[PDB]
Design a protein around this ligand. Structure first.
Ligand SMILES: NCCC[C@H](N)CC(=O)NCCC[C@H](N)CC(=O)NCCC[C@H](N)CC(=O)N[C@@H]1[C@H](O)[C@@H](OC(N)=O)[C@@H](CO)O[C@H]1NC1=N[C@@H]2C(=O)NC[C@@H](O)[C@H]2N1
Ligand SMILES: NCCC[C@H](N)CC(=O)NCCC[C@H](N)CC(=O)NCCC[C@H](N)CC(=O)N[C@@H]1[C@H](O)[C@@H](OC(N)=O)[C@@H](CO)O[C@H]1NC1=N[C@@H]2C(=O)NC[C@@H](O)[C@H]2N1
Lengths: 60, 78, 103, 91, 44
RNA sequence: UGAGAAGCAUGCUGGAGGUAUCAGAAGUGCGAAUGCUGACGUGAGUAACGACAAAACGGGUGAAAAACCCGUUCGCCGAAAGACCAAGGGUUCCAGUCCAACGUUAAUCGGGGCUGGGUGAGUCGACCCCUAAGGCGAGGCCGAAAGGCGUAGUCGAUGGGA
RNA sequence: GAACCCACUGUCGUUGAAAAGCCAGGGGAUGACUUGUGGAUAGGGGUGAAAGGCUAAUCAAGCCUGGUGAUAGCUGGUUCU
RNA sequence: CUCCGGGGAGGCGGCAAAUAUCCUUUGAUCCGGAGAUGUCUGAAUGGGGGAACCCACCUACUUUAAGGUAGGUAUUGCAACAUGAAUACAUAGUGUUGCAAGGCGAACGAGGGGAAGUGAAACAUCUCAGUACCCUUAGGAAAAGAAAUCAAUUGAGAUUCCCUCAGUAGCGGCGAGCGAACGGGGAUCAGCCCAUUAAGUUAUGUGUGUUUUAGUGGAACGCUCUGGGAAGUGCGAACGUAGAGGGUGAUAUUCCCGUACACGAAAGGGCACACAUAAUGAUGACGAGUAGGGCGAGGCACGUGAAACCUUGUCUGAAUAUGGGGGGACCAUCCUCCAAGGCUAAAUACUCCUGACUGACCGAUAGUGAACCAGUACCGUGAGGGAAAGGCGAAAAGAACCCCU
């Protein structure tokens, strides 16, 4: 999804990063409680945060 | 920070004591070092140097100002 | 040469020599062919998942050098070469030169 | 105290008899937290991400166990636990 | 009866510790030898 | 079979290498060196089972109970064989489960194996402020080099500070 | 005269419970006393109310690594026909 | 994690199977190049400290509470600027900014110090030996180097390395031992300057050539017998610029990976040559406290010897081209060179590491201490010492189920 990410602005990317970090926390809590059956969700959130930070470094 | 002549660079050197039975033991030869104050007229002050008597003879032959300039050129604080 | 998952091969070495079938998987230099090289596995019951055990028959892998691609036209073992027909690399039978039938 | 650190402070709830009794009787939440988290950070994270009021936080660190598995020895990491007391009846 | 080893962690570290070894050139040579030999633990 | 170091044939085991002849090169031959490494004997089912404070019975569980649990008796310590702190150790703490090895016997028991829990501080201690002995030490003095000593300082509790 | 610090006598122990002890007696016990913590002195050196004592179960010259495969007119051993 | 290139059907690293969620022809896993991120300790550099910890200060932005983000704050040396005592001018001292250095690591190089065991059948001169070891400091090499050199028909012609000369001439309690040179044959070859200043070297940029970091294609075998299995037997066939090697159920040129050969690069790196600009060479202009001498030592194969020559701790001390040094005491004559100022490639020394290939080298008590989770377990306060331990089967097809316990 890096091609879709690259078509956005720095300010949009920072909001996306905040949303993804909150979502990662929620996924971690759900897994810890045991309500989550899909761990690829947390893997995708982790990789998405990494991609957003890479794109921010590239764009700034 | 050593026994080194500021003018000539002389320093202790190693050698042997040789007895009448030709036993050899290590020794050192030390330079005739001492401190001496020299009037520097261009700078209106005494400069204190650690030097040998041979360095004193060199200063006698060449003048204090030339020797001081040479030491400064070699990079000494005089 | 190359042998892929969907191909139709014939066994040229081992106890299954002469038999033919469709390959199920390729991994490293071992290949599994449907219905060939069967072993009997004595399976103990799996306590957590129930699954009362028994003697089951499954396939065992053969070395890839022991199978040959089957030529549909001649029903004979053949070798695989490469040719750039038009602008794409394709597999071809060495004996005849025609392209390899797709699964 | 920024959002990135707030989202990292808390790790998960603790499931045990002591934690369950504390929650059922005294209204206390037991959390696993970052080894470097402070009491102020834990309080801010809890109030932000759960919308409750915190009166005080108690923390404790349990050193990891060294155990032999197979022929090789190993050690588990240290765990820090937070006992978060909530105001009146909440959560 | 009293034996020779009477442990004290502070004395152990101040006599044989990393900074004690680094404080002198001979201690640094000790560290170099242990690194060259490949010791898993350099100091006490 | 030959005078010998040895050779040849073949039964059984074993499951993939071996090698004529003639030359060529040697980590080329072991019984001893109180030789070196590993394995196994004799002594011999012999000595010993680690404070001479001491045990007895009923019931339980268990494949099995002198040693575990419950109960009823007996005995020993009580300026320590009781209760704490520092140092030192590091999970030995608690619960469930197991008994091969560990426990100088057996063990259902354990400081043993496995699994899961457990250490909550403004007031206790440390950290922190302060310094002793002593250590290090900008410049500095001294020394072939490495280095020695030392000023201003800076550390250092076994002591002072809610 | 207890604690505490010592070690004069005897039995036992000597492949010990212990590479210096137990037991029964014994000496000092407000002093040149005993003791915790942390420091200083390093090998022909230190320290010693002095025994060549002690300096990590090692002391008429500690331990470790190098010179080093020291040298040994001495002892032992030296392999099939 | 991103981009560029390769590749084309599987993949989510190993012990280590299974399991789930899954990813992937809208091109995954994987391979090469270039970027992004990169906690704490450690030269460790904001202060401290028992390494991986404790405590800070100053700017700018941000927040309302008790915080966050980014940057700066070590020492020494040099340069510039500012400030500034005794003390009048100054100097010392102080501060800021900029630049540089420190630490680690095989061997080889250069320099500063420097043993004893041993041999002499004892031992002191001597030997061991400028060895072991300690210390300082470079480079891809270093050092040396262009005659104040040898030679002795008046000839050679800068350094360095190899073979001879030769165990010769000599030195030596004339013992034990130490041990040249001249000349000849080779390797490599190269000279250039002292103030308008050379050869050369180092940087940056440009151009050209080559090399290197992924990869693609790559020939040709059937029947029969034994056998669990054929690559082995028997009978015929094909390729070869490919019969190197490895694997496949026993021994394969023709089954697989490969081999000979022919191709291949977005992007990056190395080297060589040519120009451009810097900078260096290069504080030095023919060499005075120098040559020589007295005293004490050291180096020369050369131990004070008939002892020349080189270095100097101490005391002295010229002439200066009608001049000076050497030719092994010394004198005369002849011959030869020009010290007291510099730079310079190759032939030479080595292997921590990278790629390819090789062995009348070892095959688990061998070969590295270590084929295996080894500098580990274990021992020691510490420096330090230091092991043992490889093999089911082609494939787990690793023994469902029954019986004793
Ligand atoms: N920091 C140092 C302090 C120095 C101090 N001031 C002492 C001093 O000033 N000078 C010391 C001498 C230094 C010299 N280099 C030593 C030397 O060269 N010896 C030579 C030894 C030769 C040989 N190996 C043994 C030998 O034959 N020996 C003899 C003799 O046995 C000895 O008698 C003793 N020995 O008992 C002495 C008579 O007494 O004569 C010796 N023979 C000789 N002696 C003379 C001499 O020296 N020169 C001139 C000539 O005459 C020499 N021949
Ligand atoms: C050589 N010739 C002269 C020369 O050019 N440089 C070195 C000058 C040394 C000379 N001995 C004078 C000196 O300063 N001695 C000190 C001294 O021994 C000691 O200090 C104290 N306080 O006792 C030591 C503590 O480390 O530090 C040294 N000095 C240091 N300077 C060094 C540095 O920066 N790096 C490396 C290491 O050499 C460091 N040691």
């Amino acid at each position: 999804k890096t091609k879709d990410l690259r078509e956005k602005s720095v300010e949009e990317l920072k909001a996306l990063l905040d949303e993804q970090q909150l979502n990662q926390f929620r996924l971690r809590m759900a897994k810890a409680t045991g309500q989550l059956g899909k761990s690829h969700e947390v893997q995708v959130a982790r990789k998405t945060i990494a991609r957003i930070k890479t794109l921010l470094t590239e764009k700034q | 920070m050593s026994k080194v002549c500021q003018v000539t660079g002389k320093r202790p050197v190693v050698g042997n004591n040789v007895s009448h039975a030709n036993n050899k033991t290590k020794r050192r030869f030390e330079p005739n070092l001492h401190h001496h104050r020299f009037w520097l007229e261009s700078e209106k002050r005494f400069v204190r140097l650690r030097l040998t008597t041979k360095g004193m003879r060199i200063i006698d032959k060449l003048g204090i100002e030339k020797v001081v300039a040479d030491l400064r050129a070699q990079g000494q604080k005089i | 040469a190359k042998i892929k998952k969907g191909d139709q091969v014939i066994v040229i070495a081992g106890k299954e020599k002469g038999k033919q079938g469709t390959v199920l998987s390729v991994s490293e230099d071992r290949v599994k062919v449907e219905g060939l090289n069967l072993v009997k596995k004595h399976q103990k019951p799996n306590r957590v998942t129930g699954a009362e055990g028994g003697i089951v028959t499954q396939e065992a892998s053969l070395h890839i050098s022991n199978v040959a691609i089957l030529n549909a036209t001649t029903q004979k073992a053949d070798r695989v070469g490469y040719q750039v027909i038009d602008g794409v690399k394709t597999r071809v039978y060495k004996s005849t030169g025609e392209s390899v039938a797709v699964a | 105290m920024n959002n990135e650190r707030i989202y990292q402070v808390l790790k998960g709830p603790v499931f045990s008899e002591k934690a369950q009794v504390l929650g059922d009787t005294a209204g206390v939440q037991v959390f696993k937290v970052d080894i470097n988290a402070t009491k102020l950070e834990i309080k801010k994270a809890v109030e932000k991400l759960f919308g409750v009021e915190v009166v005080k936080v108690n923390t404790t660190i349990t050193k990891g166990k060294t155990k032999r598995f197979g022929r090789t020895l190993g050690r588990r990491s240290d765990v820090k636990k937070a006992y978060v007391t909530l105001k009146a009846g909440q959560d | 009866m009293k034996r020779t080893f009477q442990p004290s962690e502070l004395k152990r570290k101040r006599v044989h510790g990393f900074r004690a070894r680094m404080a002198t050139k001979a201690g640094r040579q000790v560290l170099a030898r242990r690194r060259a030999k490949g010791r898993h633990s350099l100091t006490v």
